[PDB]
Amino acid sequence: KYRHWCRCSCLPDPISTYSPNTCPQKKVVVGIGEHCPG
Amino acid sequence: HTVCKSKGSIRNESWHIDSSEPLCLFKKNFTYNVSADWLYFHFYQERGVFYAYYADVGMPTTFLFSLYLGTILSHYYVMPLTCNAISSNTDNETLEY
Ligand SMILES: *[C@@H]1O[C@H](CO)[C@@H](O[C@@H]2O[C@H](CO)[C@@H](O)[C@H](O)[C@H]2NC(C)=O)[C@H](O)[C@H]1NC(C)=O
Numbered sequence: 001k002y003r004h005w006c007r008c009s010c011l012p013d014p015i016s017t018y019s020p021n022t023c024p025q026k027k028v029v030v031g032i033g034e035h036c037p038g
Numbered sequence: 039h040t041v042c043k044s045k046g047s048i049r050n051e052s053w054h055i056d057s058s059e060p061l062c063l064f065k066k067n068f069t070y071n072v073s074a075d076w077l078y079f080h081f082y083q084e085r086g087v088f089y090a091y092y093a094d095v096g097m098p099t100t101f102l103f104s105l106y107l108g109t110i111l112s113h114y115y116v117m118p119l120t121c122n123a124i125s126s127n128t129d130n131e132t133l134e135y
């Protein structure tokens with residue numbers, strides 16, 4: 001799916017955004033031992 | 039999609055196209071009872087390790103192998119088997135999964 005101003009995004013990156021509900025990237029924590037997904 | 043050997047169709051089995059051998063983590067063959075009526079499989083993941091069970095005779099299952107991936111599997115899919123042996127005009131046989 002595309003990124004949907006009316007079709008804007010987090011703006012800026014999720015590291016310093018203020019709208020986590022609309023930002024597709026969700027901050028997660030590693031569990032019992034895995035790799036950083038992104 | 040895939041095609042069955044006996045009474046093949048006009049298509050060819052084509053689900054992946056690789057010019058060279060890609061990186062693999064597990065490649066092993068297994069043998070099962072060909073005269074079995076039903077087969078059962080237990081597939082699941084835990085702590086980044088993929089476990090698999092299989093059984094040819096009887097309802098209870100037995101351990102087959104385990105594989106480490108380090109990632110989290112998300113989706114699964116069953117591709118259609120298209121050939122001229124599972125038709126209605128031929129012998130009455132259907133695919134079940
Ligand atoms: C597991 O079994 C499959 C199928 O019997 C083997 O694939 C065959 O490999 C040979 C040698 O490369 C080919 O000549 C055949 O055409 C292949 N058959 C099919 C249906 O693709 C595969 O090599 C076996 N794996 C191991 C490790 O022995």
Ligand SMILES: *[C@@H]1O[C@H](CO)[C@@H](O)[C@H](O)[C@H]1NC(C)=O
Binds near residue numbers: 072074075095
């Ligand atoms: C395979 O299955 C058939 C029918 O379920 C059974 O009679 C047979 O004992 C099983 N094992 C072998 C080695 O054929």
